[PDB]
Design a protein around this ligand. Sequence first.
Ligand code: MG
Ligand code: MG
Ligand code: MG
Ligand code: MG
Ligand code: MG
Ligand code: MG
Ligand code: MG
Ligand code: MG
Ligand code: MG
Ligand code: MG
Ligand code: MG
Ligand code: MG
Ligand code: MG
Ligand code: MG
Ligand code: MG
Ligand code: MG
Ligand code: MG
Ligand code: MG
Ligand code: MG
Ligand code: MG
Ligand code: MG
Ligand code: MG
Ligand code: MG
Ligand code: MG
Ligand code: MG
Ligand code: MG
Ligand code: MG
Ligand code: MG
Ligand code: MG
Ligand code: MG
Ligand code: MG
Ligand code: MG
Ligand code: MG
Ligand code: MG
Ligand code: MG
Ligand code: MG
Ligand code: MG
Ligand code: MG
Ligand code: MG
Ligand code: MG
Ligand code: MG
Ligand code: MG
Ligand code: MG
Ligand code: MG
Ligand code: MG
Ligand code: MG
Ligand code: MG
Ligand code: MG
Ligand code: MG
Ligand code: MG
Ligand code: MG
Ligand code: MG
Ligand code: MG
Ligand code: MG
Ligand code: MG
Ligand code: MG
Ligand code: MG
Ligand code: MG
Ligand code: MG
Ligand code: MG
Ligand code: ZN
Lengths: 144, 159, 292, 103, 208
Amino acid sequence: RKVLQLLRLTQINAGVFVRLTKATSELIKLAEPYVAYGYPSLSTIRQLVYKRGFGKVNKQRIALSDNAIIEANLGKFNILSIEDLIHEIYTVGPNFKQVSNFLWPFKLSNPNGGFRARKFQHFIQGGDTGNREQFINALVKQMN
Amino acid sequence: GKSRGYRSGTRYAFQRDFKKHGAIPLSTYLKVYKVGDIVDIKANGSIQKGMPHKYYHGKTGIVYNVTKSSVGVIINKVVGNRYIEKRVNLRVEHVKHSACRQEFLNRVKSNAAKKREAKANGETVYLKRQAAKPRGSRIISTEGNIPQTLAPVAYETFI
Amino acid sequence: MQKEFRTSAYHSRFQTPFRRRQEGKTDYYQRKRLVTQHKAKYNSPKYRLVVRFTNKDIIAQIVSAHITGDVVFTAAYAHELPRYGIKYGLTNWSAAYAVGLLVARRALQKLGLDETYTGVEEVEGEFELTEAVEDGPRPFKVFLDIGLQRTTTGARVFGVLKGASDGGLYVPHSPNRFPGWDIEAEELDAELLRKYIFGGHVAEYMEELLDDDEEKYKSIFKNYIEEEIESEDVEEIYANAHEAIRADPSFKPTEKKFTKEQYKAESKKYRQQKLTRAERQAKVAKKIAEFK
Amino acid sequence: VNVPKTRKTYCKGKECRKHTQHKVTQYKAGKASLFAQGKRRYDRKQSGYGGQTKQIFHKKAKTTKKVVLRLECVVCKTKAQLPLKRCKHFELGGDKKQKGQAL
Amino acid sequence: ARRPARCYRYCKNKPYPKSRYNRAVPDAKIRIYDLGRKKATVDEFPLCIHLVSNELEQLSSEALEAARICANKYITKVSGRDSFHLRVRVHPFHVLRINKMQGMRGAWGKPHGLAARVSIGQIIMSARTKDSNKDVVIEGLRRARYKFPGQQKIIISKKWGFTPLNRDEYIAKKTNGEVIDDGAYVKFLSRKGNLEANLQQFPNYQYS
RNA sequence: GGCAG
RNA sequence: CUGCUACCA
RNA sequence: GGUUGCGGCCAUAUCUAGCAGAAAGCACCGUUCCCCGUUCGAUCAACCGUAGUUAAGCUGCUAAGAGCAAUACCGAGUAGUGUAGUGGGAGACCAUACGCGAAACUAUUGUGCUGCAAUCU
RNA sequence: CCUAAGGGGGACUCAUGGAGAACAGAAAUCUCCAGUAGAACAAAAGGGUAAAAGUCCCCUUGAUUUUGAUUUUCAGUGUGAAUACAAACCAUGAAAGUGUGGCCUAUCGAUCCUUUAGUCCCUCGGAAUUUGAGGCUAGAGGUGCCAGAAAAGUUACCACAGGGAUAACUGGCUUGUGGCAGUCAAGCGUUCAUAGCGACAUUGCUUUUUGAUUCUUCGAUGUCGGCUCUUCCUAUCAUACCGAAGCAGAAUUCGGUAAGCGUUGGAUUGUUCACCCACUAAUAGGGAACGUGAGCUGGGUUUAGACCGUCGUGAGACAGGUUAGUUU
RNA sequence: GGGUAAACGGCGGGAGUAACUAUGACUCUCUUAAGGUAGCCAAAUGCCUCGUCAUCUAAUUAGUGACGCGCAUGAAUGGAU
RNA sequence: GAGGUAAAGCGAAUGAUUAGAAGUCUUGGGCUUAACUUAUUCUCAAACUUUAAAUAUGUAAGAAGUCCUUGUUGCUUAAUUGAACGUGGACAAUUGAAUGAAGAGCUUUUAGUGGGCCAUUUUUGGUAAGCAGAACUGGCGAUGCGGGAUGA
Ligand SMILES: [Mg+2]
Ligand SMILES: [Mg+2]
Ligand SMILES: [Mg+2]
Ligand SMILES: [Mg+2]
Ligand SMILES: [Mg+2]
Ligand SMILES: [Mg+2]
Ligand SMILES: [Mg+2]
Ligand SMILES: [Mg+2]
Ligand SMILES: [Mg+2]
Ligand SMILES: [Mg+2]
Ligand SMILES: [Mg+2]
Ligand SMILES: [Mg+2]
Ligand SMILES: [Mg+2]
Ligand SMILES: [Mg+2]
Ligand SMILES: [Mg+2]
Ligand SMILES: [Mg+2]
Ligand SMILES: [Mg+2]
Ligand SMILES: [Mg+2]
Ligand SMILES: [Mg+2]
Ligand SMILES: [Mg+2]
Ligand SMILES: [Mg+2]
Ligand SMILES: [Mg+2]
Ligand SMILES: [Mg+2]
Ligand SMILES: [Mg+2]
Ligand SMILES: [Mg+2]
Ligand SMILES: [Mg+2]
Ligand SMILES: [Mg+2]
Ligand SMILES: [Mg+2]
Ligand SMILES: [Mg+2]
Ligand SMILES: [Mg+2]
Ligand SMILES: [Mg+2]
Ligand SMILES: [Mg+2]
Ligand SMILES: [Mg+2]
Ligand SMILES: [Mg+2]
Ligand SMILES: [Mg+2]
Ligand SMILES: [Mg+2]
Ligand SMILES: [Mg+2]
Ligand SMILES: [Mg+2]
Ligand SMILES: [Mg+2]
Ligand SMILES: [Mg+2]
Ligand SMILES: [Mg+2]
Ligand SMILES: [Mg+2]
Ligand SMILES: [Mg+2]
Ligand SMILES: [Mg+2]
Ligand SMILES: [Mg+2]
Ligand SMILES: [Mg+2]
Ligand SMILES: [Mg+2]
Ligand SMILES: [Mg+2]
Ligand SMILES: [Mg+2]
Ligand SMILES: [Mg+2]
Ligand SMILES: [Mg+2]
Ligand SMILES: [Mg+2]
Ligand SMILES: [Mg+2]
Ligand SMILES: [Mg+2]
Ligand SMILES: [Mg+2]
Ligand SMILES: [Mg+2]
Ligand SMILES: [Mg+2]
Ligand SMILES: [Mg+2]
Ligand SMILES: [Mg+2]
Ligand SMILES: [Mg+2]
Ligand SMILES: [Zn+2]
């Protein structure tokens, strides 16, 4: 529960970008029975940021509808555009921490087409939790 | 009848190590403790004076007082919903310097040396420690190492 | 019929003592009491006067203990005494006194406390402790470490004690173990103590033996006979030696007839070398073959 | 418990302020006076009608008492008090133990 | 007297052996664990057949005794008392307790019986015999199986008799002079220790 | 805890 | 050591 | 490099059975007037270094040595275990998923290192 | 419990085994060797200890004085116990040191009152002296229900507030126990394991026994038995049809489908249970709130009267006997 | 210290034996005293117990008559009639 | 850093325990049995153990830090040694791991409560129990909604 809170996953169908290290991998292992995660493609990142991209501005959830919003909050980190933000996420950049924390947790819908018959078992065993590794893109296409 | 005496349940905790009973080697009495030193607490069963209570067996704290044969150690103990500062008097047989100080103090020295040398060479250096990162790409040569195919083995009884 | 005792389990569970306790050389109880220092006197060391007697030598060392091992401050041996004029009786109580005086004077020269804390310049055998001088450094404090040697009134270790005390070192002690202490009437006979300091007992043995058993006098006191040293001039040998020791207590190492490398090369010739693993395997194979 | 009839402990007397020789005696509680204020109050309360006006202890449990040594300094006659642990038998200056003998 | 074994079938309690803490414990019904020709040499009985537990379970000493008697009777009747060596490989060391022999107050029981705590795959009974006596020894164990609760398997061992060596490694070590008799068991050669004593104890040792 | 045989 | 008498922690 | 005194770690140093040991040291060794202690100058004390000896102590070496220590495509990713399922099974229990992971065993290697002072063929 | 079994110092090494020595032997005393503690350390158990913490010897009172800090239990209150220092004064040892009781973990006690020690200090209030009294600081006398009232019974004549937080029925879970049924097959059965049985073991079912529990009911579900009447179960006593036998017949025993149909009259007992007499095809076993009291009856139990025996000083008790006791 | 039970009340445990078998007529010692006498009884008093024997009946845990080491009958706490 | 539970071990200590074999009886009886001894063998421990996890648990990861120079004291040192606290100087945002942070810290005052119960896993007593008692977490109580027909 604490791990999911520290990942800012405090509701169902909340999504977040995590840079993989030993520390973050050991974090995600604790939350594994409750999450589905994987390796996102560039088009998946772009669709997420374009459709459901919001920034944390003065502790408020603000739509990323103009590059001035991104510049005013991430211009000191050389992020001047939505494509700069997408690039910084995709190629995990020197300012990944600031860019991903500026991004409000993505609030996805339920999958169009549903889950598997039973979610709460590992993807390897025919469920939905754990690491699915490239099928996160298909799942995100379903949910975004 | 319940028994909750001072040394209840310390049958194995306060035992000497196997083949390590008897006299205390004198480096224990030659170590020097200063106020502010971080020390581990480990009760020695053969010295019954100045012995810690079983709660402090295995705890690490700050030296605050130095007396003829003992040190005062500050421990933070959870009592309900907060911590309480405990002040324990321990003979030096039950005390050992904590090894975490020398490692952090070495990273401080190394950072100072690297920063000054990088300034001398006119470049920049990043001193923050990093967690282990996923490994990069690589090419595996198969000269002398052609892949060997394994299969699951049939069931056998070996009794 | 009875159980064999030295089993493999007996050896497995045996806890060997400390190396220097199994050698029968270190009393670790007494060593802990001597060495351990007040924890609020943080890195200030306690200084020990280690006094050890061999069959031929008196060893007196001023030692402080550290984690990597003991460190010698100064050391005086009885075989240095011939330089100062004492060639015979190198294990007297009086030779012990001279060695204690020598180590005291040498330590004080090394420290710089020569003019201050001279000591008892006129040895009359009275019990006395080195008192500090007001508005000056305190006397060098040293504690006596007699090791495994028994505490008896008249023992030679307290001769080294008395010599070092008169030499200016402050060494805490009591006079009830000196020769001449009357245990019934608890006072020290300083006349007999001065006799022992200046070889009076040895001179009295010379005088008493010469007129009773001349043959034994000839065998026991040969060196004195060929040196033409009588009893009446025995005392002066020490009285002069004392003075010379105070005149120049500095250590002069023996000039070495060979270098370190020459000593090592000579000694290495008489040192058997361990068999190689292959060598002992070949020996085993040969013994099997000759067993068929 | 056997305690010798003499003892050298610290004397708190202003003349002494040091270990002096003391004579040891067992403390014996003095007789309760009739003019102590609590005694006077109790007698007034008990007078008249009403019965017993205070409580009387019954449920005795101890089988021993704490022995108190009265140490009198032989120099200045200042007394000191020392309580000992609970002993069923206590003598002062008894015969000392003799180890190494048969029954 | 005795409750049905179902009351004590499962390893629900910690092991409760005889000790200085429980002393008035009765004796196990099984006292004999080796039957048949227990003095036979290793070379006489090469074939080993086991009765193996497929259960984590408790077996009473009464069941151990009954199965031992059943197997012994059948095998001695059909093939002779000296055609096999039967060994019971589980000893009942766990004390069962009975309460009734007030209410739930002070309900700590009294010793009632003894049981062996067996695991899955644990050998219960071993029978070393000749190869030609296989079907007999098997039927002796198959009858003994009825006296036990739970599932047991009859497994033909890969090894020579009661030795830990396979039936081929034993023959190799036998023709190489590395095995000597010790009565009913054997001693194996060691390449460690006193060379002379090792060579003397195994004279036919073809060293390599 | 006081007397007394 | 028996009897009688006495009982604020 | 040997040896002594004082040590640190406290068996890779211990134990058993053999063998060797130049120089110095150490040791055994000689004596009882004196200080001292004993049933016993055996231990302890003192005296000579003079009469003798490396016999022992001590040191090193030897042993498919016992023990100890270390290591490991040894066993074994086994036993155990954190987490999971509306998994199996009447149950006892078991399998699978994401993780952590022994002990015994087996084999090989080793058998004190070292600080201060003094001394020595 | 201990003037040492406390404190200091010193010397020595223990249990046990082997080999030897007059009486002397398995066990007396002497000697050597081995001996990691296999001994001992007041008392439970655990830990600790080998030039010691054990044994013996020498000297001693640190088991002393002053008042703070800390640890455990903990509210971070008290009590108990313990720890490390400060300031004294001592003991011991050549000394370094060690010693603020017992090698460590248990071995103990508030307010009020009394009593003693200390300071000989403060007060007795119109002012004094001397007695007396009261204060201040530290012990002791004790509360073991041990944070600490001053305390005998009975009630079957009984009362009240409540309680299904809790017993005495049914019901529910369980099934040890009770009952019933299997599996294996050592034996029994002239031979012959299995016609009929069946030990040592082992798997079950049942809720017709009794326990275990305490979930429901204490602003009340009428607590024994019998009589009466209906229905249901089957683990079938009889009756129908059959299979098996150590089935010649007759009788009997084992078994299958079967609850369609029946399963009694009496002596004694309140009885359920039991036990006899007799008839019968047979006189099977159970359930339905241990069916059934606005269906009865009221013999028993279980209000109040009374008697006895044992028990109690007694009032009274008895799950012992006895007699009389409103059934809406 | 003495008296007193038609005062309250009490009235027991222990140790051996007869020319088949069975039984035991056959003595002292303790509890603070005496140790249940004459009688009566499975009685409204007996647990075991529906005691045993006889009688009564076809059959009787009922009744009566016997028996009595009587859990725990008994003499104005009145016994037996 | 600490630990002694799971596992493991018993030809390792303690305690328990099955079977032979070879020796000694010289301090057992009638070739024999039984003792011991030696090397082996089967099987065990909540109040056994050499070893020894997983989970859980103590501390640290800087600016109140590190380094350099030299002031005070009645403490401490033979000391010009230290101890503690200081004056002065250098090291600047990669000020020295991650992730998160509807901010942190502090105070006063007062309510109800002090019958609990259930599920997974660990676990004690009991034959067991919709039984009695503990550990961690999550729940019901205090909670509706969709599913398990019905049901804290
Ligand atoms: Mg659709
Ligand atoms: Mg679904
Ligand atoms: Mg430990
Ligand atoms: Mg103590
Ligand atoms: Mg000493
Ligand atoms: Mg009144
Ligand atoms: Mg009056
Ligand atoms: Mg249990
Ligand atoms: Mg003691
Ligand atoms: Mg003593
Ligand atoms: Mg001693
Ligand atoms: Mg407290
Ligand atoms: Mg307290
Ligand atoms: Mg002193
Ligand atoms: Mg002190
Ligand atoms: Mg008062
Ligand atoms: Mg007045
Ligand atoms: Mg008190
Ligand atoms: Mg109370
Ligand atoms: Mg209380
Ligand atoms: Mg009343
Ligand atoms: Mg009543
Ligand atoms: Mg209830
Ligand atoms: Mg049943
Ligand atoms: Mg049954
Ligand atoms: Mg109920
Ligand atoms: Mg009710
Ligand atoms: Mg009603
Ligand atoms: Mg009704
Ligand atoms: Mg049927
Ligand atoms: Mg039929
Ligand atoms: Mg009914
Ligand atoms: Mg009705
Ligand atoms: Mg009615
Ligand atoms: Mg009725
Ligand atoms: Mg009535
Ligand atoms: Mg009437
Ligand atoms: Mg009636
Ligand atoms: Mg009636
Ligand atoms: Mg009678
Ligand atoms: Mg009569
Ligand atoms: Mg009668
Ligand atoms: Mg009659
Ligand atoms: Mg009657
Ligand atoms: Mg009748
Ligand atoms: Mg009638
Ligand atoms: Mg009659
Ligand atoms: Mg009567
Ligand atoms: Mg009567
Ligand atoms: Mg434990
Ligand atoms: Mg285990
Ligand atoms: Mg193990
Ligand atoms: Mg064992
Ligand atoms: Mg309130
Ligand atoms: Mg409250
Ligand atoms: Mg309440
Ligand atoms: Mg509620
Ligand atoms: Mg809910
Ligand atoms: Mg619903
Ligand atoms: Mg359902
Ligand atoms: Zn005085």
